[PDB]
Ligand binder design. Sequence first.
Ligand SMILES: [Rb+]
Ligand SMILES: [Rb+]
Ligand SMILES: [Rb+]
Ligand SMILES: [Rb+]
Ligand SMILES: [Rb+]
Ligand SMILES: [Rb+]
Lengths: 91, 91, 91, 91
Amino acid sequence: EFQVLFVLTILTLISGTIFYSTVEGLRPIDALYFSVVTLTTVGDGNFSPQTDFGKIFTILYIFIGIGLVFGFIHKLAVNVQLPSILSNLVP
Amino acid sequence: EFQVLFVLTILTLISGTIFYSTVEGLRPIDALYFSVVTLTTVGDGNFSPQTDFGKIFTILYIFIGIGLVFGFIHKLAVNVQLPSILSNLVP
Amino acid sequence: EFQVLFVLTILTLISGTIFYSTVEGLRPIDALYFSVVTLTTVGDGNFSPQTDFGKIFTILYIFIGIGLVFGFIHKLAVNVQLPSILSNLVP
Amino acid sequence: EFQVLFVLTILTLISGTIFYSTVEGLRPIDALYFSVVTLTTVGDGNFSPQTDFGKIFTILYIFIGIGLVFGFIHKLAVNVQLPSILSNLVP
Ligand SMILES: [Rb+]
Ligand SMILES: [Rb+]
Ligand SMILES: [Rb+]
Ligand SMILES: [Rb+]
Ligand SMILES: [Rb+]
Ligand SMILES: [Rb+]
């Protein structure tokens, strides 16, 4: 479950990285950063896509990627972080 | 369920698009972009409504639209994305 | 339930409105706008508190207000919007 | 439960505060503010990390810290705020 969600999240972020560096001209690391803060809904305080293609893609990217990203974060905190913490509280 | 949530989400976004392009003077695509990042809570890093009417509308728009938009995203990821993925993992 | 959550949400927003207009010098409508986009986690793309008092208050305001605001949004969409829609789909 | 989530949240915020003030050169209060609005997904409207190290750290920080922070907010609103309110509504 976690493995699949991890892979799916990675693929989604690679797509965003490729899109923004190509269409919006961002450096790859910046394209990845924007993709991550967008899908996790944190948002970026400085960059907004400047092209209409970028705006349309971002709208679709958000609707299709938010569920997955939070599905991964949700399982990562309950199936990987909770135990490593829960079992730790055991005297 | 998904169909109705889809339609409701679309209608909500059309209202925002019309409002912001009219009252805030945004190009339609920009009004749609702002409506989407606002209701999905990603937020925009460059635009904030400049008129008091725009600020009041945005406040009400957020409270009334967030639930719906996330209801659609939630069902889209579980009733349309989960299966298309779950059934795929079947050897 | 909805009534109490509504009142609590209103009181929380009034406190933020008073704080930001007083300490950060925002016009009341702007203080309310900032309080709303902050607690709903949409965030504002232009304003960040400029005083240390404002930054500390905002940190505490977020932790104490996010739960409530989303408790209100959650119930508003399920106990007031769902029915008005669910009952409507009835031929 | 609440105590542990509180401590874990505090430790996570201290790490962010140290990272951003050191690598991004922010004043400690600003580093804490950025860490908080980032992990609660509110986001900051003015600051984005400027170094590649800062961008990479922020990406990892978000994925590892969002679950916890919202686990704390969730329990704080249900196991500490709900009762103090629920018991109050009792005539
Ligand atoms: Rb958010
Ligand atoms: Rb934001
Ligand atoms: Rb700016
Ligand atoms: Rb945000
Ligand atoms: Rb900005
Ligand atoms: Rb922002």
